[PDB]
Design an enzyme around this catalytic site. Structure first.
Site, mmCIF file in Angstrom:
data_model
loop_
_atom_site.group_PDB
_atom_site.id
_atom_site.type_symbol
_atom_site.label_atom_id
_atom_site.label_comp_id
_atom_site.label_asym_id
_atom_site.label_seq_id
_atom_site.Cartn_x
_atom_site.Cartn_y
_atom_site.Cartn_z
ATOM 1 N N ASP B 69 2.364 -9.969 -15.418
ATOM 2 C CA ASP B 69 3.599 -9.262 -14.848
ATOM 3 C C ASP B 69 4.348 -10.082 -13.912
ATOM 4 O OD1 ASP B 69 3.035 -6.796 -15.759
ATOM 5 O OD2 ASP B 69 1.846 -6.208 -13.885
ATOM 6 N N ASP B 168 7.387 -6.926 12.368
ATOM 7 C CA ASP B 168 7.625 -8.307 11.661
ATOM 8 C C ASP B 168 7.973 -8.197 10.216
ATOM 9 O OD1 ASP B 168 5.791 -8.669 13.865
ATOM 10 O OD2 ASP B 168 4.511 -9.915 12.736
ATOM 11 N N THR B 179 3.653 -0.164 -6.821
ATOM 12 C CA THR B 179 2.231 -0.582 -7.049
ATOM 13 C C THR B 179 2.095 -2.127 -6.763
ATOM 14 O OG1 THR B 179 2.989 -1.023 -9.181
ATOM 15 C CG2 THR B 179 1.750 1.069 -8.686
ATOM 16 N N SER B 184 -0.066 -2.851 -1.155
ATOM 17 C CA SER B 184 -0.956 -3.627 -0.103
ATOM 18 C C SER B 184 -0.578 -3.601 1.263
ATOM 19 C CB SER B 184 -1.052 -5.139 -0.640
ATOM 20 O OG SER B 184 -0.039 -5.718 -0.277
#
Lengths: 283, 283
Positions: B69, B168, B179, B184
């Site tokens: 990917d 931040d 995705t 995450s």
């Protein structure tokens, strides 16, 4: 311009003044007014033209929903069956469907009647169990009868198998619902006019579950293994429809649209920030 | 049908066989083949028609991107500038842009060449700093130079002030990016063809922050107070563009589209589940 204005809502007794003030104000300004049957009775409006909610929905050009977002919930699900403009007066702070502050309601409404309004369409959800047909402005929720009871089901999107799940239920929310029950379940905020629908699991069994945002032109199908526990579907926290054995649930975009309007000085992000406690302009 | 097939990718040395096998196979089946310059050199293909990525993108009808990917990431950002069909061969498991498994690549590709494919369009992001113009398939990320450094900024959506933020950084992801890095960071999964863009804060200062999903036809503007710290914008983890004092960032839907294709037996939710570890069919 609006010829026939309807007053909707169900007033504790000090919310009645608002209905009373609005009805006389609207009236003295020359409008034909339809009040809801209960409020006509509560205010003893002998001259008032009354009607059920469906009546006002068919004969009024604008419905002023007085009350909170919850009052708006039952009202909206009906008024969305019709081509009527809907605007709400909240009580205190702004809500996501009620943006007329009581302190300035008349003044803002006066400009709205002049034709100074932002008009938008919130879409609804439709549910079949197979046929019982129920609708929702905020969300449809699959859940058992017992509170902490793990259920199993499969989720089909557009007739094709998407994923299985072990959990305590699934929330399926519209953009309007995204700031509601779904939010408190860890779901994301969707912008109100977005063509999207979010699926949020409740207490998933696997750690890899995440809110899924799909297209609003998509169809959803719930299939179940067996029934010794009582599956239920709730729409906007109204009475749960039982789900029998061999039955499936079908959820899709409803054809009914809430024709909301807002005053010119309305903006979503300002409503959102005040509601969620986000920072205002920093420089 | 496809007249000119291009092979793209940058092969550790055992990925070379794949390129070698594909080039001979494609060739013996009668196709004109353009290999990337590096691979022609690496495989010593003296007869091969070669070209840069832009060349293949302008002259080939289909590009087979071999690799992972990440390989697809740089390749896609370029090939999206052109009306070329792009399909990828992964290495091992499925990815969100690479769905030809090596164990069955030729067989599946053989059917694709026959015209058995599902064709879809992934949109990209565009960024100006004000003018430097950079693009992204996955996400644009605002962040300082120091890792744990709190910045302040305001976010304008469609020319109007949305909200302030102390944090931040901000991640702005496409459906394809949802995705990725965004996931995450606690963001939601968006379905790939959805007309949506998700904003996810990084280490927000207030507890009430949440992923915001907005329309992809929407414009975003980042405004900053002062600069004693180094603001940077990254697109798909490529070299950070510095953001000077008095400068703003403008992010919007790019006009370039990735023309992905898939074999008939492809489905998003199956890719997603295998990738995320979701349950397959239960009954």
């Amino acid at each position: 311009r609006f010829d026939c204005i309807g007053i909707v809502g169900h007033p504790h007794p000090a919310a009645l003044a608002t209905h009373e003030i609005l009805y006389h104000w609207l009236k003295a300004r020359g409008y034909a007014v339809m009040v809801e049957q209960q409020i006509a009775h509560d205010l003893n409006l002998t001259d008032a033209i009354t009607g059920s909610l469906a009546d006002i929905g068919q004969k009024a050009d604008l419905a002023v929903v007085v009350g909170g977002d919850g009052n708006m919930l039952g009202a909206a699900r009906v008024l969305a069956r019709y081509d009527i403009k809907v605007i709400g007066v909240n009580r205190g702070n702004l809500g996501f469907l009620t943006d007329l502050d009581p302190d300035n309601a008349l003044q803002q409404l006066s400009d709205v009647l002049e034709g100074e309004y932002l008009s938008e369409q919130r879409f609804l959800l439709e549910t079949h169990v197979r046929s019982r047909i129920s609708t929702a402005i905020n969300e449809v929720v699959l859940h058992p009868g017992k509170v902490a009871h793990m259920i199993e089901f499969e989720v089909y999107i557009d007739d094709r198998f998407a994923f299985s799940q072990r959990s305590d239920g699934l929330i399926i929310a519209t953009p309007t619902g995204s700031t509601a029950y779904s939010l408190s379940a860890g779901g994301p905020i969707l912008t109100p006019t977005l063509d999207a629908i979010v699926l949020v699991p409740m207490f998933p069994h696997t750690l890899t579950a995440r809110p899924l945002v799909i297209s609003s032109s998509s169809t959803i199908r719930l299939k179940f293994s067996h029934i010794t526990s009582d599956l239920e579907i709730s729409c906007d926290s109204q009475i749960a429809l039982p789900i029998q054995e061999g039955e499936e649930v079908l959820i899709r975009r409803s054809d009914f649209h809430l024709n909301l309007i807002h005053p010119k000085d309305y903006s979503y992000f300002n409503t959102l920030s005040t509601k969620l406690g986000w920072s205002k302009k920093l420089f």
